[PDB]
């Protein structure tokens, strides 16, 4: 009975409530209904990030990027994953890619991406 859009919307409301494993499951139901929508994977990847499930977030970012090569959030969440796994060069490049795509796409996330790039470059440096 529930549409994939419906299920995604439910996931988003769970995400607002900080119920991440639940939210991730709803996105999983969204995928079950339509597995060709990158947002579903991008949305679940963020859930996994919040759950410190980095391997799973990576896999989702990859699935999203196969469906949408222009995905800002897939590149950003990938970068944040790799950062938390001490893969700085790749992380910085992916955050930088996100910055570029968001400019190209007229998306406003305030100072979130530059802030993240600073965090990444600083952490990388703090490890020399």
């Amino acid at each position: 009975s529930p549409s994939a859009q419906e299920l995604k919307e439910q996931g988003n409301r769970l995400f607002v409530g900080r119920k991440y494993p639940e939210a991730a499951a709803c996105y999983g139901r969204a995928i079950t209904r339509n597995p060709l929508v990158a947002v579903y994977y991008t949305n679940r990847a963020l859930c996994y990030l919040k759950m410190q499930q980095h391997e799973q977030a990576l896999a989702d970012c990859r699935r999203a990027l196969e469906l949408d090569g222009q995905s800002v959030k897939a590149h950003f969440f990938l970068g944040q994953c790799q950062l938390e796994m001490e893969s700085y060069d790749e992380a910085i490049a992916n955050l930088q890619r996100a910055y570029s795509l968001a400019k190209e796409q007229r998306l406003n996330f305030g100072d979130d991406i530059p802030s993240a790039l600073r965090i990444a470059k600083k952490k990388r440096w703090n490890s020399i």
Partner: peptide, 10 residues
């Protein structure tokens, strides 16, 4: 264009 937090689902 409204500023929005990036660590949010779409």
């Amino acid at each position: 264009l409204p500023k929005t937090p990036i660590f949010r689902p779409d």
